[PDB]
Design a protein around this ligand. Structure first.
Ligand code: HEM
Ligand SMILES: *[C@@H]1O[C@H](CO)[C@@H](O[C@@H]2O[C@H](CO)[C@@H](O)[C@H](O)[C@H]2NC(C)=O)[C@H](O)[C@H]1NC(C)=O
Ligand SMILES: *[C@@H]1O[C@H](CO)[C@@H](O)[C@H](O)[C@H]1NC(C)=O
Ligand SMILES: *[C@@H]1O[C@H](CO)[C@@H](O)[C@H](O)[C@H]1NC(C)=O
Ligand SMILES: *[C@@H]1O[C@H](CO)[C@@H](O)[C@H](O)[C@H]1NC(C)=O
Ligand SMILES: [Ca+2]
Length: 595
C-alpha cells in the first residue's frame, strides 16, 4: 500500500490556496501535496538508505561489520591518501572567476541544510565526544589513522555529531533514518529572507513601512548598508579575534558568516532588496510595507533563479546541460521539487574549487595594502576584516578578478579546508572538511558509487582496470582500490568528484546527472518559477531577463568597472567595462495600474 504518515514535527499550516506569493516555509507551493518542498521535512530518498543495520547505524560504526565483505577505510585516511596535496602553484582555473565558487555556495545554502543533532547547550555529551572520542548515540568521531601528524598534535580524533532526523530526533522510530532539510527546496532566496516565520520576522525592519529589511547599526560601508550583527552567544566571529569582538552577521541562513566571501555575497543581496523596495515605493507610494517586501522578495527570487539557470548551470554542466535540463515548457504539478539526500553530497563538488587565498583589491584592481592576500583559514567566521579593513568593495573586486581553484585528480581539496578548518563548538583551526564529507555520507546512509552510476545509466566498474578506464587515471584508481577494495564501496562524494570533467563543464558524468536532475525538478516543480505564465507579466519578464551579476555589483558597491560575464575568468582591464555599459533593471513595469 502507501502512507505519508510519519513526520509530524509541525510546521503544519493552513494553505491560502492561491495568494500572490510564496510562504516563507515553502508550504503551499504544490496544491495537491502542500508539504512538498517545505522546510523542516525529510530530504527525499532517490534510492533507499544503506545503513550497517538496515535502519540507522552508519557503515564504519561497528569494527567487525564489513561493507560487501571489506572494512570501510577511515575517512581521514581517504582524506590523507587521495584528497590532499602540498603545492598550490598551477592549481587555479583559467576560465572561472572566484565568483563561480562563491555563487555555488550561495545557491547551495538556498537549497539544503541538514543541521546536527543539537541536544541543546549545557551538555556533557559534547565533552564526552570531543574530550574522549568515545563513539555512542550521536557522537560518531573521525578517528585519526596511525601515521597521521594530527595524532601528535591534536589528539585521537576530530569530533563529529550525527545529523538530526525526522519524527523524533532523540530516540528514533522504525523504518530507515531520514535526515532533515531545514531550508526550502525552492530556489527562492530563502538564504536572504529565511525559511521560518520567526527568523523571517527578525530580518524585517518593521518600524518604517517601506517593506525594507533590518540593516546594521554600528557599521557603515562608505554610505552603504551592512547586514545586522547576530544576537546569540557564544559567537565564533568574536572567538577568532577576541580583541576586535565583531560578531557574526544575521541572515536567512544559519551559516552566513562561515567565510568572509559568503558574508560578502549576503551583503550584495540585502542591499539589492532595499534598493528594490525604496524604488518600488517611489513608483507606488500607495503600496504598504508588506506589499513592498513581497514584491522586492519576488524580484530577488527571480534574480537568483535567472543568474543560476542562465549563467551558472551552463558552465557547471557544460555539454550535459541540455541533456538533463531541457528547455522549460511550464509548471508540472506532479514534479517532486524536494531536494534529495544525494544532492546534498553531489553539490559538495564546490569544496574542490575553493582556492587557498583571498585578496582585497583597490580601484585600479591592484593589491589593497601590504597584507592584501590572506590564507583562507584566517577568514573562517571573520566579520571584522570587513569592518576594519575597508568594507566589501576590496573583496568583491577579488571575486571578479581572481580565479576559482580547478578540480584536479592530484590536488582535490586545499589544506586550508582539509587540515585547518574551524568548527564553532571547538577551539582550533585543525579540522578536515574532506573527512567530514566522507563521514557525513555514511551518517546519511548513502548508497556507494556503483548504485549511483546505475541510477544514472552509467557503467558500474568492478575491477582495478574498469575503474582506471572510468576515472582515466591509473594511480588514482589504484589508491581508491587500495583503500576501498571494491568500487561498490567508494563513498559518493569522492567517487563523483574523482571523475574527469565533461566538455565545457566543471563536473564529471555522474555529478552532472545527479545535479542536472535535481535542478530540473526544482524549476519544473515550482509554481512560483519566474517563467511560469502569470507569475510576472510579459513586460516584467522582459525587464528581468536584462539583470546581470555585473549590474547588481554596480548598484550595490562603489565599483564602476565590472566585466560583462562575471563568472568566467576576467583580467583587468581588457575584460572590464564602465558600469554605464551595463543594462540597468527597468522597474517601470511594476507601476500599479489600479484606477
Ligand atoms: C570557504 C568555502 C567553504 C567552506 C568553509 C565550506 C564549509 C562547509 C561546512 C563546514 C559544511 C558542513 C559539513 C558537514 O558537517 O557535513 C559544508 C556543507 C556543504 N557545502 Fe560547503 N563550504 C565551502 C564552499 C562550498 C561551495 C563553493 C559549495 C558548492 C558550490 C558548497 C556546498 C555545500 C553543500 C551542498 C553542503 C551540505 C549542506 C547541507 O547540510 O545540506 N560548499 N560546507
Ligand atoms: C528601519 O528603517 C528606518 C527608516 O530608515 C530606520 O529608522 C531610523 O533609525 C535611525 C536611528 O537613529 C534614525 O535615522 C531614525 O531614528 C530613523 N530614520 C528614519 C528615516 O525614519 C532604522 O534604522 C531601521 N531599523 C533597523 C533595525 O535597521
Ligand atoms: C570561457 O567560458 C565562456 C562561457 O561563456 C566561453 O564562451 C569561452 O569560450 C571561454 N573562454 C575561454 C578563454 O576559453
Ligand atoms: C584582531 O583585530 C585587530 C583590530 O581590531 C587587529 O589589529 C589584529 O591584528 C587582529 N588579530 C587577529 C588574530 O585577527
Ligand atoms: C509531469 O511529470 C510526470 C512524471 O515525470 C509525467 O508522467 C507527466 O506526464 C507530467 N505531466 C504532464 C501534465 O505532462
Ligand atoms: Ca530555498
Amino acid at each position: 500500500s502507501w502512507e505519508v504518515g510519519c513526520g509530524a514535527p509541525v510546521p503544519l499550516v493552513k494553505c491560502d490556496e492561491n495568494s500572490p506569493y510564496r510562504t516563507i516555509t515553502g508550504d503551499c507551493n504544490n496544491r495537491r501535496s502542500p508539504a512538498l518542498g517545505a522546510a523542516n521535512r525529510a530530504l527525499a530518498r532517490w534510492l533507499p538508505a544503506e545503513y550497517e543495520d538496515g535502519l540507522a547505524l552508519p557503515f564504519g560504526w561497528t569494527q567487525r561489520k564489513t561493507r560487501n565483505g571489506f572494512r570501510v577505510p577511515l575517512a581521514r585516511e581517504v582524506s590523507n591518501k587521495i584528497v590532499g596535496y602540498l603545492d598550490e602553484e598551477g592549481v587555479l582555473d583559467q576560465n572561472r572567476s572566484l565568483l563561480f565558487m562563491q555563487w555555488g555556495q550561495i545557491v547551495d545554502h538556498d537549497l539544503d541544510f541538514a543541521p546536527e543533532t543539537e541536544l541543546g547547550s549545557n551538555e556533557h555529551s559534547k565533552t564526552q565526544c570531543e574530550e574522549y572520542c568515545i563513539q555512542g548515540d550521536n557522537c560518531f568521531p573521525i578517528m585519526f589513522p596511525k601515521n597521521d601528524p594530527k595524532l601528535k598534535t591534536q589528539g585521537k580524533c576530530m569530533p563529529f555529531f550525527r545529523a538530526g532526523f525526522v519524527c523524533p530526533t532523540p530516540p528514533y522510530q522504525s523504518l530507515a533514518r531520514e535526515q532533515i532539510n531545514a531550508v526550502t527546496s525552492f530556489l527562492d532566496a530563502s538564504l536572504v529572507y529565511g525559511s521560518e516565520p520567526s527568523l523571517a520576522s527578525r530580518l524585517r525592519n518593521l518600524s518604517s513601512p517601506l517593506g525594507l529589511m533590518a540593516v546594521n547599526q554600528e557599521a557603515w560601508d562608505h554610505g552603504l548598508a551592512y547586514l545586522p550583527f547576530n544576537n546569540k552567544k557564544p559567537s565564533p566571529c568574536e572567538f577568532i579575534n577576541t580583541t576586535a569582538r565583531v560578531p557574526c552577521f544575521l541572515a536567512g541562513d544559519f551559516r552566513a558568516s562561515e567565510q568572509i566571501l559568503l558574508a560578502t555575497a549576503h551583503t550584495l543581496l540585502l542591499r539589492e532588496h532595499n534598493r528594490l523596495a525604496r524604488e518600488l515605493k517611489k513608483l507606488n507610494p500607495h503600496w504598504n510595507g508588506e506589499k513592498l517586501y513581497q514584491e522586492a522578495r519576488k524580484i530577488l527570487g527571480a534574480f537568483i533563479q535567472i543568474i543560476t539557470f542562465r549563467d551558472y548551470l551552463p558552465i557547471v554542466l557544460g555539454s550535459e546541460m541540455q541533456k538533463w535540463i531541457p528547455p522549460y515548457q511550464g509548471y508540472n504539478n506532479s514534479v517532486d521539487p524536494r531536494i534529495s539526500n544525494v544532492f546534498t553530497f553531489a553539490f559538495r563538488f564546490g569544496h574542490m574549487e575553493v582556492p587557498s587565498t583571498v585578496s582585497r583589491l583597490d580601484e585600479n584592481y591592484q593589491p589593497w595594502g601590504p597584507e592584501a592576500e590572506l590564507p583562507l583559514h584566517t577568514l573562517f567566521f571573520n566579520t571584522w576584516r570587513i569592518i576594519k579593513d575597508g568594507g566589501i568593495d576590496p573583496l568583491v573586486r577579488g571575486l571578479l578578478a581572481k580565479k576559482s581553484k580547478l578540480m584536479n585528480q592530484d590536488k582535490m581539496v586545499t589544506s586550508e579546508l582539509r587540515n585547518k578548518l574551524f568548527q564553532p563548538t571547538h577551539k582550533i583551526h585543525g579540522f578536515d572538511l574532506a573527512a567530514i564529507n566522507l563521514q557525513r555520507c555514511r551518517d546519511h546512509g548513502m548508497p556507494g558509487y556503483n548504485s549511483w552510476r546505475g541510477f544514472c545509466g552509467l557503467s558500474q566498474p568492478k575491477t582495478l582496470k574498469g575503474l582506471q578506464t572510468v576515472l582515466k587515471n591509473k594511480i588514482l584508481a589504484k589508491k581508491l582500490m587500495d583503500l576501498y577494495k571494491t568500487p561498490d564501496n567508494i563513498d559518493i562524494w569522492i567517487g563523483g568528484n574523482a571523475e574527469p570533467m565533461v566538455e565545457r563543464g566543471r563536473v564529471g558524468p555522474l555529478l552532472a546527472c545527479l545535479l542536472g536532475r535535481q535542478f530540473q525538478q526544482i524549476r519544473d516543480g515550482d509554481r512560483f518559477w519566474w517563467e511560469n505564465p502569470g507569475v510576472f507579466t510579459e513586460k516584467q519578464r522582459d525587464s528581468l531577463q536584462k539583470v546581470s551579476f555585473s549590474r547588481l555589483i554596480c548598484d550595490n558597491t562603489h565599483i564602476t568597472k565590472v566585466p560583462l560575464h562575471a563568472f568566467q575568468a576576467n583580467n583587468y582591464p581588457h575584460d572590464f567595462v564602465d558600469c554605464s555599459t551595463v543594462d540597468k533593471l527597468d522597474l517601470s513595469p511594476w507601476a500599479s495600474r489600479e484606477n
